[PDB]
Amino acid sequence: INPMREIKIKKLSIVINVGGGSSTRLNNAAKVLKQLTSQDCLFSKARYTLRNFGIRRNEKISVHVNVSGDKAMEILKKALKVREYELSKDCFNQTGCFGLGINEHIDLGMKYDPDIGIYGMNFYVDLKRPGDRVSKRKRFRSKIGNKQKISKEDAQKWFVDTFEGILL
Amino acid sequence: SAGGYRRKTRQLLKQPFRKHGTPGLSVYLATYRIGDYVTISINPSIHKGMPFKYYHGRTGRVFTVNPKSVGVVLHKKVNGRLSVKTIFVRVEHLKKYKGRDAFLERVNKNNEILKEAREKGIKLEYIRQKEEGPREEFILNLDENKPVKVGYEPFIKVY
Amino acid sequence: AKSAATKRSRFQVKRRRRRECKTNYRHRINLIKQDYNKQGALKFRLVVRRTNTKVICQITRSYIDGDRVFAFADSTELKNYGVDFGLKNHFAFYATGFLAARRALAKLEMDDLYKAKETDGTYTVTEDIDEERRALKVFLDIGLSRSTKGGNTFIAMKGCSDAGVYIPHSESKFIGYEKNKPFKADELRDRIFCKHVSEYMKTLKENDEEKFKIQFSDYIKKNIEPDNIAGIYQNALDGIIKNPSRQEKEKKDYSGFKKFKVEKLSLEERKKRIQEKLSALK
RNA sequence: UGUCCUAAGGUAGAUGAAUGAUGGAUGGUAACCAUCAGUUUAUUAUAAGGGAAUAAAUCUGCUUUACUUUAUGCAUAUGA
RNA sequence: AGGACACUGUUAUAGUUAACUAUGAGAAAUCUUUAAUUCUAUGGAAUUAUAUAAAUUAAAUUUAUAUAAUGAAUCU
RNA sequence: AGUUACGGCCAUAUCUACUGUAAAACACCGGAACUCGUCAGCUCUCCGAAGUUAAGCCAGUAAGAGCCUUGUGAGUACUGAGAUGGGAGACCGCUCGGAAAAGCAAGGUGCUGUAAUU
Ligand SMILES: [Mg+2]
Ligand SMILES: [Mg+2]
């Protein structure tokens, strides 16, 4: 097999959905993502005003951080142990990605620190083969070939081999 | 449809089908000199230098060349007479008027015939445009041509 | 609720050179405009492009049927002067345009009146002589690449000004310039010569002997020492001022290469292949 | 239609808009995050018409060309 | 004008696994299209040699101006 | 005889499926000591040459969609000039001239300018 046909991990994304008017719940949760990885947080705003969710327009809601490198492997190997390395069949998309969510970040292995509080988050991963610079460059922009795109069953193969786990 | 500068332009200032967008480089590379012949065609994608809508498609002559404008002289039909107009337009609204090219070639070739006949004692046999008169004679052959009988035919309804 | 056929018929296809993501058509037209009075005077432009392992520099003047080149220079021509280890460095952009502008004047015989300067790094723009012809005028095409402070494209126009060809530019995009201060001419002189490359090479030896053999392997395989690079680079510039002429190649004939060519299938084989496809079904 | 704008004026640079499909703890028709598709459906102060997809649209920076003086044309004329 | 249902506005019913396939009706403020007619311009000046500039170009290099000579070219 | 850098005309050059290329070139590709840029060397910027022809670029196949062109449609629809022609009217017929589209068949699927390398 040619080594350009391999599958890898492009990036991982973390999202903490808090909804509130207090900046103290934001700034407490902003320290948790810095405590997990040394990157800094990035905020998000609202699109409209929804009374049923306690949301007004142009107002801060949540935080998210995009990570890459080998640091993403240490966060991913922790999160799979919470579900005992067991996943469903429908978590895989048409394009190849998948995700999961954990109710408690204390199960990740941090300290309590009670004034910070207890939160929860959900993760999402990306898979790309080598040769993905073609659709991303400015000069010489073009499409990807039809032979190199990942499908749903290709995620079902690579997940079991790199992590010995159970499919449901 | 009141009296304004751009009245009643719905199909005259519309860009045609599958041809939208800013013009190309072959427009900008052309040059103009004093005494040429130029037709006017509005490109409705630039808004600096458009003439009035009356002059769309009339040919004139170029008398001045400015850093941003070209001067064209024309003729308008005011109530009794034929007057003289001057307008300044941009380069992206013009076109080189053809129609003298067959004439200017005839000038250059007749000037060569005059030169070769100077060395001889003959009279000039110039080139002028042809004339069409009565129908000339021709010769048909009945060896391979057979006549076809034509007649009427009875009427038949379409259903 | 439109069909699949109407969505294709209403499609307007962009231009061919825009389709391949190679040019910016609004940027080109503003470069080659001209006032209408100067009919006989065509503009010049210098093109600086790089491939993955080369630097290409051309001087052109545009026409209706297509462009034409006046003089070109290739970064792979520097083997004749002794620089063949770095073909994409900060020095490689400088010497290529320096050979380009030196080659253009020798077509016009202005080599005696306008000669090269010494590579000091001071911000200067050449001027006119009192009685003779004025200097030549060339503008710069940046292409599609973004503009930064220490870019490699901006140092190639520095090489054209040192050959004597007049190019309007300002010192704001150079290395060692800060606002409201005199220009640090010696700091620019350390990036023109490959001093930062040599001190990275000296640092890697005592720090990581394993990583250094991977990164600078052609510097290892050729017998090239880091403490002497600018002695070789300075010797390379002196040969260009002596002789800028090209060297001719003999013309061979390549007609045996025609065998890697596929024609289109004819009409007789097209109608034959259809009935064999219909034969297997019945 | 008798209005609005120190930016909604000037210029440089960066940029797949509206929407749809499939997924992700609490999360539902509808909160946020990733992936793929996306020929102009979106926006451009306003009536209608015309124009614009490396964009005249959305962001980031810097500024006051919302100047002073010689001559001429176009609506448009016999004529302010 | 004629034409078309492909864009914008409109309308009757049957089928196949919201999408495709049929037979019907249409447009003063709709257009992938498009005649008969109406109108604008050319059908004689161009080339050569020499000179002038304070314009213009990298440049006798262009853009312009003079003087000399060489001419009747579509039907009524 | 093909590539590669600038292009002119801007679909015969687009879109959806499969298949192939010796040399050289073009790419993918390895990293952040310095200039520069981000939440993230993803993009941009700056140094490189272990690996790979899987993709991109180039060239092919399809009773393929789309575009381009010839014939039929058809002297059919329509129309410039005219008469003490016909009809309650709506309108129709004749003489001397000009002359269509949509479909339905058959065929095609970029051409080219300056320079460089095998
Ligand atoms: Mg204005
Ligand atoms: Mg505006």
Side-chain angles (χ1 to χ4, degrees):
Chain A
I1 302 169
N2 223 2
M4 303 317 283
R5 288 265 303 163
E6 295 167 26
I7 320 178
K8 281 145 192 163
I9 290 172
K10 177 171 178 181
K11 64 187 175 195
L12 194 142
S13 46
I14 56 186
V15 162
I16 295 186
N17 286 119
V18 303
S22 67
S23 158
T24 176
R25 283 293 297 277
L26 307 179
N27 291 270
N28 282 12
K31 298 166 193 176
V32 194
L33 299 188
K34 182 99 167 200
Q35 198 165 159
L36 199 146
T37 327
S38 157
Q39 284 106 10
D40 311 340
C41 77
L42 201 69
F43 290 88
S44 45
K45 284 178 177 172
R47 272 204 165 164
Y48 296 115
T49 297
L50 294 184
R51 157 160 281 210
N52 261 29
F53 300 130
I55 287 177
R56 55 187 301 152
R57 186 165 175 160
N58 216 340
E59 195 265 339
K60 308 218 161 198
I61 301 174
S62 286
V63 289
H64 65 287
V65 158
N66 276 11
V67 80
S68 69
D70 52 356
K71 279 176 167 180
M73 273 304 300
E74 303 320 289
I75 310 163
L76 195 150
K77 280 185 151 177
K78 283 198 191 175
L80 290 179
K81 231 183 181 181
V82 181
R83 307 213 191 198
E84 314 179 64
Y85 281 63
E86 300 182 29
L87 280 178
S88 178
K89 277 167 194 177
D90 44 19
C91 48
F92 298 131
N93 305 318
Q94 301 172 357
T95 62
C97 321
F98 57 95
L100 77 159
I102 303 170
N103 288 322
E104 193 191 42
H105 77 90
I106 310 297
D107 275 357
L108 271 299
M110 278 153 295
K111 304 313 284 175
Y112 200 88
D113 195 304
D115 46 313
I116 296 313
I118 307 180
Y119 300 113
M121 57 194 76
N122 45 2
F123 319 100
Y124 212 76
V125 298
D126 196 6
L127 308 186
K128 289 289 181 167
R129 308 204 186 200
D132 207 45
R133 204 179 175 266
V134 176
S135 87
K136 255 66 195 168
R137 44 186 170 169
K138 179 194 180 184
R139 190 153 165 261
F140 303 126
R141 206 163 195 158
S142 195
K143 269 197 176 183
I144 325 167
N146 215 4
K147 270 192 169 170
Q148 294 193 304
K149 38 190 63 180
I150 306 171
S151 84
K152 210 185 155 182
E153 299 146 34
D154 310 306
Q156 293 189 353
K157 256 197 174 178
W158 175 92
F159 166 65
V160 187
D161 294 336
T162 58
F163 302 95
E164 279 83 46
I166 305 180
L167 283 170
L168 309 161
Chain B
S1 79
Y5 204 82
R6 211 173 164 181
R7 51 208 195 255
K8 295 219 160 179
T9 78
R10 185 167 178 162
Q11 309 96 353
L12 197 41
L13 294 190
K14 183 165 196 182
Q15 215 154 7
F17 181 55
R18 271 193 280 165
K19 270 145 200 162
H20 297 279
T22 296
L25 195 69
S26 308
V27 171
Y28 292 79
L29 276 157
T31 61
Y32 299 111
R33 294 154 179 78
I34 295 172
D36 284 331
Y37 284 88
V38 161
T39 68
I40 297 176
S41 91
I42 296 178
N43 191 359
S45 44
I46 48 165
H47 309 321
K48 278 179 168 177
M50 277 209 295
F52 195 43
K53 74 178 179 68
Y54 171 74
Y55 307 103
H56 178 270
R58 319 221 160 197
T59 89
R61 279 174 95 186
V62 167
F63 70 103
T64 44
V65 172
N66 272 322
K68 286 199 221 171
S69 43
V70 187
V72 179
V73 290
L74 289 172
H75 275 291
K76 208 189 180 187
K77 188 184 159 204
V78 177
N79 47 52
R81 50 197 201 277
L82 278 179
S83 42
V84 167
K85 293 309 177 85
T86 62
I87 48 172
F88 301 126
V89 291
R90 275 211 186 174
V91 76
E92 315 184 8
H93 296 292
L94 303 190
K95 185 189 285 186
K96 271 220 174 186
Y97 169 74
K98 310 182 184 175
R100 289 201 80 176
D101 308 334
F103 175 62
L104 274 184
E105 187 264 359
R106 198 197 99 186
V107 162
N108 276 347
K109 192 177 282 186
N110 263 323
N111 214 329
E112 291 160 15
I113 290 177
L114 177 62
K115 183 187 168 169
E116 310 312 299
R118 288 297 201 190
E119 268 59 50
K120 310 198 167 195
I122 53 173
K123 195 41 92 157
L124 322 164
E125 286 85 20
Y126 277 150
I127 288 183
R128 65 188 296 169
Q129 65 181 358
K130 68 182 287 184
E131 80 278 19
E132 280 274 3
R135 182 198 44 82
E136 269 63 38
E137 66 184 9
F138 53 91
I139 299 171
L140 280 197
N141 53 331
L142 306 181
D143 279 347
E144 53 88 20
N145 208 344
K146 223 174 188 177
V148 173
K149 268 197 158 181
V150 190
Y152 280 97
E153 214 178 3
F155 188 75
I156 276 179
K157 275 177 180 177
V158 301
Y159 68 100
Chain C
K2 310 176 193 170
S3 89
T6 71
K7 286 173 167 189
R8 185 64 35 208
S9 294
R10 299 313 285 278
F11 210 73
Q12 168 155 353
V13 165
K14 305 191 175 184
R15 297 166 182 168
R16 183 179 66 102
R17 188 54 68 92
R18 169 61 194 83
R19 217 176 316 167
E20 303 177 336
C21 274
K22 295 197 165 182
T23 185
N24 180 21
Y25 264 98
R26 193 187 69 98
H27 190 273
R28 174 175 164 86
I29 278 179
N30 280 342
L31 184 53
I32 320 169
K33 257 190 178 175
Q34 191 75 95
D35 311 345
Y36 306 137
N37 323 319
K38 314 166 182 175
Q39 300 103 359
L42 294 174
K43 280 189 172 182
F44 279 95
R45 55 195 209 108
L46 171 85
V47 186
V48 174
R49 303 295 160 79
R50 49 159 279 258
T51 81
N52 216 352
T53 48
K54 264 189 306 177
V55 179
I56 313 181
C57 291
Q58 311 160 40
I59 306 182
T60 51
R61 29 163 52 180
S62 176
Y63 289 99
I64 286 186
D65 40 355
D67 288 14
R68 295 168 181 167
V69 295
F70 206 67
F72 87 111
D74 214 1
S75 175
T76 181
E77 270 172 359
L78 306 183
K79 304 157 188 164
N80 300 326
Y81 313 131
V83 173
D84 51 356
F85 42 88
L87 273 81
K88 214 176 66 172
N89 265 326
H90 215 291
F91 174 76
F93 276 87
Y94 182 81
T96 310
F98 191 83
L99 177 53
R102 201 62 207 156
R103 207 196 296 278
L105 298 175
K107 199 182 177 183
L108 269 65
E109 303 170 42
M110 305 214 291
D111 311 338
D112 315 342
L113 296 166
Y114 287 71
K115 339 170 197 180
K117 333 174 178 189
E118 190 60 42
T119 81
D120 207 346
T122 43
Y123 169 66
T124 47
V125 165
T126 181
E127 288 277 351
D128 285 329
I129 317 295
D130 285 342
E131 289 101 2
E132 289 92 346
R133 300 169 63 184
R134 300 186 211 91
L136 197 146
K137 212 163 172 171
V138 159
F139 312 99
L140 167 70
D141 179 276
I142 203 67
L144 264 184
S145 65
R146 288 161 67 114
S147 43
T148 58
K149 201 172 186 173
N152 299 153
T153 41
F154 296 136
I155 206 67
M157 82 179 164
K158 185 75 184 73
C160 271
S161 172
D162 300 355
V165 181
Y166 158 70
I167 283 181
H169 70 300
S170 46
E171 60 167 309
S172 157
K173 305 284 268 190
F174 279 148
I175 297 167
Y177 152 74
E178 294 225 352
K179 326 170 191 185
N180 298 316
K181 290 152 201 167
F183 185 47
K184 304 285 204 173
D186 214 16
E187 310 192 40
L188 182 70
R189 205 198 92 83
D190 290 1
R191 291 278 291 172
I192 294 157
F193 298 93
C194 279
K195 194 173 183 174
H196 60 280
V197 195
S198 44
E199 304 316 300
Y200 175 44
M201 278 176 61
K202 289 174 182 173
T203 317
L204 279 189
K205 218 170 209 172
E206 65 259 7
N207 289 163
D208 281 312
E209 194 78 15
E210 306 185 3
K211 193 188 173 188
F212 163 69
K213 284 177 185 174
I214 282 181
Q215 167 85 24
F216 294 116
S217 297
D218 193 79
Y219 275 105
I220 290 300
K221 169 198 173 193
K222 310 192 169 183
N223 300 113
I224 299 175
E225 318 296 326
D227 44 358
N228 48 3
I229 318 183
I232 289 95
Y233 279 173
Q234 172 57 227
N235 192 29
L237 280 149
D238 309 333
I240 306 172
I241 319 173
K242 294 309 163 37
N243 188 279
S245 294
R246 250 182 53 91
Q247 189 166 199
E248 280 163 356
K249 306 166 53 218
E250 67 280 346
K251 285 176 187 185
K252 302 175 192 178
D253 198 5
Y254 304 129
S255 197
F257 287 80
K258 210 188 159 153
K259 315 173 164 195
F260 324 100
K261 205 180 188 296
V262 196
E263 298 278 347
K264 292 216 163 196
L265 273 181
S266 174
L267 190 63
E268 325 292 329
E269 290 90 340
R270 272 188 176 182
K271 261 152 190 182
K272 201 177 180 185
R273 281 161 63 102
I274 294 169
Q275 196 166 183
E276 305 161 29
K277 221 192 172 177
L278 278 183
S279 76
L281 300 172
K282 302 178 177 189

